[PDB]
Design a protein around this ligand. Sequence first.
Ligand code: 9HI
Ligand code: 9HI
Ligand code: 9HI
Ligand code: 9HI
Lengths: 396, 415, 421, 421
Amino acid sequence: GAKFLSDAEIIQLVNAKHLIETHERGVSIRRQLLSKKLSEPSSLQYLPYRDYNYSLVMGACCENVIGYMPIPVGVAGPLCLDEKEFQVPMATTEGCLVASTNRGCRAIGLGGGASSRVLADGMTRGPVVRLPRACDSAEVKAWLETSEGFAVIKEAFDSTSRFARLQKLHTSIAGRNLYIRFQSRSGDAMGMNMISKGTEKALSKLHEYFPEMQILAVSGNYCTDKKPAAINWIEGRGKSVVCEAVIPAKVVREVLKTTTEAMIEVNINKNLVGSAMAGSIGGYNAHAANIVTAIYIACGQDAAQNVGSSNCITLMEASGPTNEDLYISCTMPSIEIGTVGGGTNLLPQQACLQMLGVQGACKDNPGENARQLARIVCGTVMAGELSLMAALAAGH
Amino acid sequence: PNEECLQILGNGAKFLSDAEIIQLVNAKHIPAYKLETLIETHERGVSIRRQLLSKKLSEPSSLQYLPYRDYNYSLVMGACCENVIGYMPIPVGVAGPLCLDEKEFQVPMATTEGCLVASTNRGCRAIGLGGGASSRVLADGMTRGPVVRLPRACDSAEVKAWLETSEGFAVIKEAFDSTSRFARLQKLHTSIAGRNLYIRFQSRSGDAMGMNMISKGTEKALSKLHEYFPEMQILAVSGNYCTDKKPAAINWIEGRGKSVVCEAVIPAKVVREVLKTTTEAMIEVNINKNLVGSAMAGSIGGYNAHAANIVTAIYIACGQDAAQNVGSSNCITLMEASGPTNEDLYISCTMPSIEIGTVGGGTNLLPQQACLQMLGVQGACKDNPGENARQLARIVCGTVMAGELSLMAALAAGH
Amino acid sequence: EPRPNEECLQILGNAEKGAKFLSDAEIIQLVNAKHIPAYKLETLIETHERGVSIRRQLLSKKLSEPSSLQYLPYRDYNYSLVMGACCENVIGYMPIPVGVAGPLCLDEKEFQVPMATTEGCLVASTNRGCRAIGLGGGASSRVLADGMTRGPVVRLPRACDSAEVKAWLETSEGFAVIKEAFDSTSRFARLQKLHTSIAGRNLYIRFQSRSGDAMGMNMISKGTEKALSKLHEYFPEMQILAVSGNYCTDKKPAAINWIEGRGKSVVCEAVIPAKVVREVLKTTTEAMIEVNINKNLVGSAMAGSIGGYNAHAANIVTAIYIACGQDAAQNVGSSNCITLMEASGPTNEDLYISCTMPSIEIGTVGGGTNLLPQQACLQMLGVQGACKDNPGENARQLARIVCGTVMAGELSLMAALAAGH
Amino acid sequence: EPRPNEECLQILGNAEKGAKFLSDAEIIQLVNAKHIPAYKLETLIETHERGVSIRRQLLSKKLSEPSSLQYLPYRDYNYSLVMGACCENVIGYMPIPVGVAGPLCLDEKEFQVPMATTEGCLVASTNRGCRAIGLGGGASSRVLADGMTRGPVVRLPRACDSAEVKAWLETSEGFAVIKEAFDSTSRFARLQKLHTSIAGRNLYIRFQSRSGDAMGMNMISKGTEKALSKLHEYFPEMQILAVSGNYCTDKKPAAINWIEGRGKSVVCEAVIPAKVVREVLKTTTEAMIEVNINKNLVGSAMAGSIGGYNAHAANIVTAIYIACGQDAAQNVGSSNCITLMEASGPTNEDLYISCTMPSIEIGTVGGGTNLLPQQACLQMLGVQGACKDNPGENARQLARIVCGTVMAGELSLMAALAAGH
Ligand SMILES: CC(C)c1c(S(=O)(=O)Nc2ccc(C(N)=O)cc2)c(-c2ccc(F)cc2)c(-c2ccc(F)cc2)n1CC[C@@H](O)C[C@@H](O)CC(=O)O
Ligand SMILES: CC(C)c1c(S(=O)(=O)Nc2ccc(C(N)=O)cc2)c(-c2ccc(F)cc2)c(-c2ccc(F)cc2)n1CC[C@@H](O)C[C@@H](O)CC(=O)O
Ligand SMILES: CC(C)c1c(S(=O)(=O)Nc2ccc(C(N)=O)cc2)c(-c2ccc(F)cc2)c(-c2ccc(F)cc2)n1CC[C@@H](O)C[C@@H](O)CC(=O)O
Ligand SMILES: CC(C)c1c(S(=O)(=O)Nc2ccc(C(N)=O)cc2)c(-c2ccc(F)cc2)c(-c2ccc(F)cc2)n1CC[C@@H](O)C[C@@H](O)CC(=O)O
């Protein structure tokens, strides 16, 4: 069929208001079609496309594909975290970011490593529904807060998927609007599609108890996904994580080129007081977003979720016998992450997840790989904070 | 032989083999950090670093499918990335044409979320069938917000009053502007918190995003301030008052980088046929999702559906700092009735802090430049400095609006 | 005339005599040059009003205008209920005018709502909004949640230890132990779901419970202190850093109050016929909706507001609070409100309106509600004091009336801005 | 003796008789028989107190307990300065106990600060903070900015047009034309650089200007209306949607007040020697810094606060505001405060403290400051009325006192939380 025709002939068919056997050739024909629309048709020539595995992308990750975009990958490590060592991949185009993070890892190792805990775990979706009156929506809130009501909604939610196990609901009324925050774990997936599916069946079960309920939108911005929101900061979303380390005064002096006292002064007055004066919600850190974004791109995460995933408070205190050692912690309540699905289905992204030993599903304990990646992100963010803050204090 | 290989390094490394250099590191004849300068070519440096790293992994075959061959590392080395072990391919799709200010754009989008490019593309189609979109740049100026301390709050108050005078500001403006061609300091904004003083330097940067340039002007400006106030301590060149890569109301209210607005009217027929909904249904969902819903969630600047998706995809494709998506995604999406019988859809997005550039950083790499060239905005604009970066910002805000139209229509339609 | 300090001290020390056997001038002598500090005037002097008078005379000599206090009243006020309970170093009182806005038609009842204010037109404006609601068939409200909070911060030696305490508090058995300790301190102490947050080795714990008709801060703090003492038995290394760590959050703006609620969360609503909107409010439904979206939603958004999606709910909350003996400083969070307006009815021309106020901090027992004048304003609404057969009902009713009067005030001010002066 | 309705009305309409020649019961008989509307009472009745008296009697019959107003006082209060200026439908007045905390040692002066509250121990606590400041060598404050705002919303046909008006307002000649219009409305009107923001075809314009010693909403709104009238000449398609689009922002929480300021921006400071922290405040500098960081910075941060980085600034602000005739609803934003605490001296045992309050909304002329008891409390501080030779100094001085009393409050409460108990 299509293999017998030439390139010029197939394009003659597309323009004349009228499939291909190989994926790479389809990408080439789309480049040639697109070339005819651009003022500089030669602009595509250094946008690569050859010898990429497009089979895992089509009908899954991207449409109208004209190639790919190489992002340089560097390694910050070893990062000593919970008695293990990690070579952390970081996809960035910002010079010195990997080298800065790498120095932070070095300081943590010489202080006996970092320790981390996951505090909560559950992806969310926050639909908006409407009832005729605010009194009716008040009735639905009261019903959802009974043990009986939650149990039928939990049963509906949990019937849609293996890992769909519903946790406590959170709700808000705004007049006759009702926002309902469904939270659940999702194995090792980030869990978006899984929770929306459970939400749809849970909402249709709610509709049987309340036939006059309109489902306005499956997302009413109460999740909250990919926008800044105090609800992710206060309630969490995905993995809530804490990480810490104590850096000996010697190691702060020799590696970090500053003092424990000077680090505390900059952290308080930049990360707390400065972020406060700027009107920040959840942005009490130096540059967590650099690290999160770099790891996310390299590891097949949804990079748009750095909006909320970068939420972080970095604290720095005096520590030890002479009060000269630096205690550091980062607390990140809303790390949105996964080791299956999305961009983690592609081979290059999996290579970076394999480096960290978290690629794919953890079969013995569903969800444990994604949990480990969240811990790795929090630890690497703390390395980034340690290093950049030291540079800022030393005052270059 | 080990000491035979060291004698060849005295002449070179190019003559040796992979296993011999790795033998020289494992036995401690030579430390690993010296391999940067010794090996001549960049691609072989990446290869050795991969082999050395792989033995330390618990699964030594992890890097098999991470590509590294036949990529331009010369532009990346010493300017974009360190400890390089390869590159990460992110698929690029195209949404267009986007009909924006009498021009048509094919918008590159680096993403791995299925149906994002297709959804965005449908929004473009609805905009085009509704007579195009229009956009305006409202403000332009990258910021840096250092923190200084004085001995007392009374002294810091004195410095604030001095910076607010005509003569004080002029002396600070001259030191700032002496560092670069495009360095042109606009009115300072300051906040005191006790003996702390946070100073927000704002300025255009031509077509660069402008982080490095504003920081050079900031350091020289603070140096002149030090002569007028010797007791002043420069605590940190960034005091989170900029604010860069963290959510902050100051970016939402004062702006950062390019502030941009965009708009269009979608005819009622186009809303039914292309978007599978009505104007009345779109409006109801926008009010209660993007305003009231974001309000109930405690949002500052997150009055949109998924601006972040579009901002992030364009940013990766176009060599932007993708971490700046945090602030650059700030967006309010408004929808309302238009036309004779209130049946057409007026839509607008306003994005006050798009941080962006067409020169410097990742826009110096050729693949990223190709996507910039697709849009006709690659590199500097000699005649009108800053016009390429202003145009990309308008493209981002317009593409975001296309994305808001499409997703909001799907949410209003249900199922 | 005033005899020396020695004779003045012996007469004060004598039980048969006391401060009654001294002149004003002699008491001012023993203060000027120690022996009596100033705060001891409370317990020592014969009557409360004389103690106030003496304090005023002392104060007037320190001032640069000695006649400053001339028009600050103090005589004949009932200071018995104020000393040792509501105020110290008392030098008089401040009269705040009290107007009435009503009848407010709320839940098939009517309410004459007291409002203490000095802003001109506020009471008449709110009264106009009440009339519009009345001609629209009345307003309906519901209490959505109920629980005053307190948000202490503790510290463990490590964040891993603070993480251990968070997880233990989340087990059913762990919460049960802490709930038992909390609930034993008072008959109204009934601990609800706990919310916690970690910041490194800090752990913020939000204790929440109903509190009868009292606003309930004293009671929650006493329950909180016993709960933390018990938590220390299981975690001896835990340090209580502060009984409030600003996680409550009390008297400061905070997203947590907006999202979780504090005290009473309340929604109120009403449909105003298109006829009434024209005649009474001098505007149209179409115009009110447009002003509400673009002022109270879009405008507040551009201003970077958390919970301030309203026109002037703080005016009504503050006025009712001062009149009804509430803690007026809690206006900060109690004014949190989102006002929504949309089309309604067959024509699509009638104005639907709702106010949602997640964090009304309110009580009809304790504090300023012990004073008789502000008890009079509470009695107007039928919510004075405790409700025996149904504890908490007077405080719940007062929260409904606040949210209903706010909606009336929103109706009226929004109509005025819509019509153009 | 009570006459028929028709006879009572001929006396009412008789110009040389009126209501004076009728009894209370006759006027009430006329009201219940629908001959005089209840609102017409104000103008018909000769004496203000008698109007209040009769309004109270009417109100009482409607209440479910007729004696509920017995303890709400009304007699012998100066309603002349309240009717048609500060309050309507007036049924009396609400006395708030006034206490005094001082001396507050501020800028080498001493202040006796009046505090109207019903919360036990607030005045004593605040007074202890004053003592620590006085023995600590005093506090120093500075006014960093000054200018009340109004933030109207206007609408252009398209977003492109609103961008056109925005860029027009930013040119020096366009701004100069609007500034002459604004400044022409009052002698204090001095329009500062305009701050604007676009949301689609909306345009929020933030007019700022000093206002003498008045708080200044009447003045700023009057200047704003003439300003937008001039703007409409240049842009006739522009629609003034509301004179307030919540971009001011008045009486709602908003990041814009925190960042740009509104009213008086003020910083206050002091160094408390270790000895004084020990003997007055019963604690150490180290314990206080640890509580301050983890409560007022970190705790407020975890709660998601905008501008609420303090312990109880709102307590002090509210008490002073009620006592001094301010708009107490403006404590929502006026209470905005960040409290910082540092180690000072050779061994880190002295306590540097500062409070920064960017948006104190205050005034010594107009509003409740026209009333005489309120004026007495202003006279205590030497800030009553207008300053002749230096306009705005009295309002500025009151804002520095408010920030210093807040700092005293912060000192005391934080010491108590650092102790235990
Ligand atoms: C890339 C690393 C991560 C980096 C560093 S660094 O790695 O430590 N040091 C340098 C120094 C010079 C270069 C160069 N050749 O231009 C590169 C790296 C610094 C920095 C630190 C202390 C200094 F004295 C000077 C520079 C800065 C940096 C921070 C705030 C500035 F104002 C200005 C530069 N950044 C970027 C952080 C950036 O992406 C988020 C910040 O904007 C977040 C914030 O702190 O607000
Ligand atoms: C990818 C596009 C952009 C997309 C779409 S879409 O383009 O319109 N349609 C589809 C349908 C099916 C697939 C598939 N095969 O998985 C992919 C796209 C939808 C959507 C909308 C209405 C619907 F009835 C069904 C699906 C959703 C979507 C939104 C909220 C949900 F709860 C659940 C799915 N998303 C993701 C948006 C996501 O990245 C930000 C949102 O989380 C932001 C927000 O609205 O809060
Ligand atoms: C007191 C009432 C409550 C009041 C009113 S009112 O009830 O409608 N009428 C009058 C009539 C005459 C006087 C007088 N001075 O003699 C005072 C009020 C108005 C107002 C509003 C729109 C108009 F077209 C005309 C007047 C305003 C008011 C609002 C925004 C202004 F810019 C300017 C005046 N206010 C104050 C509201 C104030 O306490 C919170 C608002 O500032 C909150 C906000 O909307 O941002
Ligand atoms: C009124 C004063 C100002 C007051 C004080 S106080 O004046 O210093 N001490 C008092 C007060 C009263 C009595 C009494 N008779 O029972 C006894 C001692 C205290 C307090 C502090 C440390 C303590 F060990 C005991 C009490 C508290 C207080 C704060 C947070 C608590 F959790 C619990 C009590 N408050 C209330 C502050 C309140 O209006 C805003 C705070 O809630 C703001 C905040 O910190 O979040």
